[PDB]
Amino acid sequence: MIPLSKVAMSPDVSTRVSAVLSSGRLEHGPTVAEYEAAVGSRIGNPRVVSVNCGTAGLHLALSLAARPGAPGEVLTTPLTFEGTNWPILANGLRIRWVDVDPATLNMDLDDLAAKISPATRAIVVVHWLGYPVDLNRLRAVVDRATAGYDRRPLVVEDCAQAWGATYRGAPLGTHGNVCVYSTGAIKILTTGSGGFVVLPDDDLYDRLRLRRWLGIERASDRITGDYDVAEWGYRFILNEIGGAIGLSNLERVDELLRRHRENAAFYDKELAGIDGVEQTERADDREPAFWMYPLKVRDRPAFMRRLLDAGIATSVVSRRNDAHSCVASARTTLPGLDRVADRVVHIPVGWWLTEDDRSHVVETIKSGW
Amino acid sequence: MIPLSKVAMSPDVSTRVSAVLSSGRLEHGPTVAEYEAAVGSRIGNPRVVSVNCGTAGLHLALSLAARPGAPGEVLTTPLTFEGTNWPILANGLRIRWVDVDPATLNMDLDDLAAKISPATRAIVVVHWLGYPVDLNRLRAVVDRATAGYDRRPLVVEDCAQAWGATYRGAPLGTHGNVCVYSTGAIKILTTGSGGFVVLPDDDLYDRLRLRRWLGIERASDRITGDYDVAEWGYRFILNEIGGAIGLSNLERVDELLRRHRENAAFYDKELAGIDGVEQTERADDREPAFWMYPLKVRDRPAFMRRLLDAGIATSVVSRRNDAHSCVASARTTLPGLDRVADRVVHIPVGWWLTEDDRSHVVETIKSGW
Numbered sequence: 001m002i003p004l005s006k007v008a009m010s011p012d013v014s015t016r017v018s019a020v021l022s023s024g025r026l027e028h029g030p031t032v033a034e035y036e037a038a039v040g041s042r043i044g045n046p047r048v049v050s051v052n053c054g055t056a057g058l059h060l061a062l063s064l065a066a067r068p069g070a071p072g073e074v075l076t077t078p079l080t081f082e083g084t085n086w087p088i089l090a091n092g093l094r095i096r097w098v099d100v101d102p103a104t105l106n107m108d109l110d111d112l113a114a115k116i117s118p119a120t121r122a123i124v125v126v127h128w129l130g131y132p133v134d135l136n137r138l139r140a141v142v143d144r145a146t147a148g149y150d151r152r153p154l155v156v157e158d159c160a161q162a163w164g165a166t167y168r169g170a171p172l173g174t175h176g177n178v179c180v181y182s183t184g185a186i187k188i189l190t191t192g193s194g195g196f197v198v199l200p201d202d203d204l205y206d207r208l209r210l211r212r213w214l215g216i217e218r219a220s221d222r223i224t225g226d227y228d229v230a231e232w233g234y235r236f237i238l239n240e241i242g243g244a245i246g247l248s249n250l251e252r253v254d255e256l257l258r259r260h261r262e263n264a265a266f267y268d269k270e271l272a273g274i275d276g277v278e279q280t281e282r283a284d285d286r287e288p289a290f291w292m293y294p295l296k297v298r299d300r301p302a303f304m305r306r307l308l309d310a311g312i313a314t315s316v317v318s319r320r321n322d323a324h325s326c327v328a329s330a331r332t333t334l335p336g337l338d339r340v341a342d343r344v345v346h347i348p349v350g351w352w353l354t355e356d357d358r359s360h361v362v363e364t365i366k367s368g369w
Numbered sequence: 370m371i372p373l374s375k376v377a378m379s380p381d382v383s384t385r386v387s388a389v390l391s392s393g394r395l396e397h398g399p400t401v402a403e404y405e406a407a408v409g410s411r412i413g414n415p416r417v418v419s420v421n422c423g424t425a426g427l428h429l430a431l432s433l434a435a436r437p438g439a440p441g442e443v444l445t446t447p448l449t450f451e452g453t454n455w456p457i458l459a460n461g462l463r464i465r466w467v468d469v470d471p472a473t474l475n476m477d478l479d480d481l482a483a484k485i486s487p488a489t490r491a492i493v494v495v496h497w498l499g500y501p502v503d504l505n506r507l508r509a510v511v512d513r514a515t516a517g518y519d520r521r522p523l524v525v526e527d528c529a530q531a532w533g534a535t536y537r538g539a540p541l542g543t544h545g546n547v548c549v550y551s552t553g554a555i556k557i558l559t560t561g562s563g564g565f566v567v568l569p570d571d572d573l574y575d576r577l578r579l580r581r582w583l584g585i586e587r588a589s590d591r592i593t594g595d596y597d598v599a600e601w602g603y604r605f606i607l608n609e610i611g612g613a614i615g616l617s618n619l620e621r622v623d624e625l626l627r628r629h630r631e632n633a634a635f636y637d638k639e640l641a642g643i644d645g646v647e648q649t650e651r652a653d654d655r656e657p658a659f660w661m662y663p664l665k666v667r668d669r670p671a672f673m674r675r676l677l678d679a680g681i682a683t684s685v686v687s688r689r690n691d692a693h694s695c696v697a698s699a700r701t702t703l704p705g706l707d708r709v710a711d712r713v714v715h716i717p718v719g720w721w722l723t724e725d726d727r728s729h730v731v732e733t734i735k736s737g738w
């Protein structure tokens with residue numbers, strides 16, 4: 001009854017979409033271009049490549065690792081949605097798991113330094129819940145590790161839950177890495193389905209824009225077949241309906257985010273000093289998006305059960321990916337993750353919470369379990 | 370001014386789409402299932418798996434060849450959209466080109482017979498413009514070539530332009546092969562973006578539905594994390610907005626298809642016996658969809674130029690895929706394709722043609738070039 005997630009849809013969407021459908025342009029249209037421009041202006045990076053989902057975005061980005069370009073590994077975290085990691089396999093690269101930092105629920109950057117190898121083609125970091133990874137440390141770790149390597153591996157930030165997040169005052173997508181956002185249904189900015197990739201320079205921008213549509217320069221004369229495909233690609237475009245939904249929702253999203261953060265600040269204050277309730281780390285040099293609010297709790301089943309009876313939806317959200325049969329071969333001991341897997345839990349913190357809803361959650365947690 | 374392709378959107382779509390938008394259910398909802406059933410009911414095969422585009426349908430289907438499953442090649446035609454063939458490469462398989470039959474613009478089935486090898490994991494045929502491949506022959510040829518092989522290669526039909534097409538009295542999707550359809554913007558039945566895969570049996574249907582959503586059993590409890598992934602998958606689902614549009618347009622597509630065929634029969638009669646204009650083969654035992662109308666013409670550049678001056682859009686549609694740099698290694702001599710590549714051309718034949726528009730095309734072609 002108090003949901004963990006909710007679709008945020010502008011009341012303007014039904015009208016905007018109706019116009020797009022009657023327009024005669026559903027793909028490769030101007031609405032998607034306009035959306036991309038608007039996103040780019042927000043992030044502070046004009047290099048935005050929209051796609052039909054976040055998983056596609058990662059798939060597209062990782063194709064840079066596999067095919068730069070015209071034995072390889074990707075270092076990644078198992079604590080995330082499978083969509084973060086199966087694109088690694090689809091690109092024909094091996095998964096090597098990096099442990100999780102129990103204080104942030106993000107990648108352990110010291111285990112990373114240990115596991116970076118000449119075989120490392122790419123590194124994927126997930127900003128879990130929109131809590132930014134220490135990108136300065138990440139850059140330092142990658143630089144120290146790959147000093148002689150003759151090519152630096154690709155750093156990919158999975159920003160799927162991280163719309164609105166800032167690091168050192170600037171939005172994610174501006175720190176020199178390839179960043180993938182998701183704009184799926186319950187992401188705070190939604191296009192229905194969709195995502196976009198933000199690139200750090202024009203080469204990556206051009207290359208990913210090409211591979212988004214089969215490697216075909218769309219400015220070419222394909223009416224006579226006078227074009228060449230030098231690098232094969234995928235079919236990952238976002239269509240005019242998505243762009244329309246996105247532009248509408250961009251107008252409302254800053255206010256939703258403000259409510260997420262306000263609700264989170266309320267929890268950090270009120271849930272502090274509760275025995276059996278450990279909160280997630282907080283740094284001064286970043287502003288989390290708080291897509292959901294994380295806690296690490298003793299006796300989690302009793303915790304969730306107690307909150308569920310009080311009408312509060314609660315979830316583990318995802319299984320550690322390293323436990324799936326399909327990646328049995330990459331299975332390795334990750335003690336940090338072991339220490340949080342059975343304790344981590346997510347509670348509603350989003351824009352749909354009223355003042356009383358928020359108190360009810362805190363009061364319910366205070367009633368013990 | 371007389372366009373070659375046009376978006377077909379029922380005027381009723383806004384209402385249906387609006388319902389989806391007000392539901393809070395944008396992905397994984399019942400509308401897509403309702404659509405899949407309706408398609409299945411028409412095709413006469415219930416094993417329909419919707420996907421977010423036709424290329425993704427092919428990507429997913431070919432994964433059966435690559436990963437059966439829990440060195441390979443694909444025999445395919447180069448006369449087609451690149452979305453047909455790049456999924457071969459995304460699945461990590463080799464492309465081997467089969468020549469084209471210059472009368473049908475489809476695969477030379479005798480050339481196919483010669484190139485089938487123990488290395489063939491799959492065979493891809495395209496029903497170019499919705500003119501059906503002789504599937505009976507394809508089956509006999511595959512069956513004869515692979516007699517001892519201990520596993521029959523996967524047979525995949527690209528039906529992207531073939532909605533409504535019929536072969537030997539039955540719709541495509543009923544002849545025992547895996548069939549992939551597109552419902553992209555200018556295909557005659559559109560979902561905005563989208564496609565679907567039709568399977569010949571329940572094992573393949575279950576498997577593709579699985580890989581459609583990351584290899585996650587959707588009947589499983591993912592809120593407490595009690596699920597396993599045995600076969601990693603992709604993120605290819607069609608969303609509720611696509612399903613809604615598809616349901617609307619299903620109500621109108623039969624009349625649109627009837628107009629395509631009526632215009633094609635008109636051309637067949639009226640364009641016969643024009644010097645420099647060779648038409649495509651027509652068999653009695655199939656009913657083509659005529660997404661566009663094919664001609665093979667002397668001096669194609671002067672031809673297209675002449676019709677452009679009369680306000681008639683005209684196109685080669687796609688480059689022979691075998692000429693692309695990205696696949697330089699698979700380049701092989703294809704004399705049949707050589708014989709038509711510079712002569713093939715497409716002229717408007719769709720449902721938007723007025724009786725006067727249709728006369729104008731015929732009249733223009735007869736004025737010479």
Ligand SMILES: Cc1cn([C@H]2C[C@H](O)[C@@H](COP(=O)(O)OP(=O)(O)O[C@H]3O[C@H](C)C(=O)[C@H](O)[C@H]3O)O2)c(=O)[nH]c1=O
Nearest residue numbers: 024025026027028222372374375376450553554555686
């Ligand atoms: C996507 C789209 C196209 N059109 C018009 C515009 C063109 O005059 C004509 C073809 O459009 P486009 O530039 O997209 O053509 P191609 O790039 O060769 O590709 C199209 O035909 C090949 C075979 C594929 O397989 C593509 O999926 C399909 O997009 O139909 C519209 O009016 N609205 C639209 O949304």
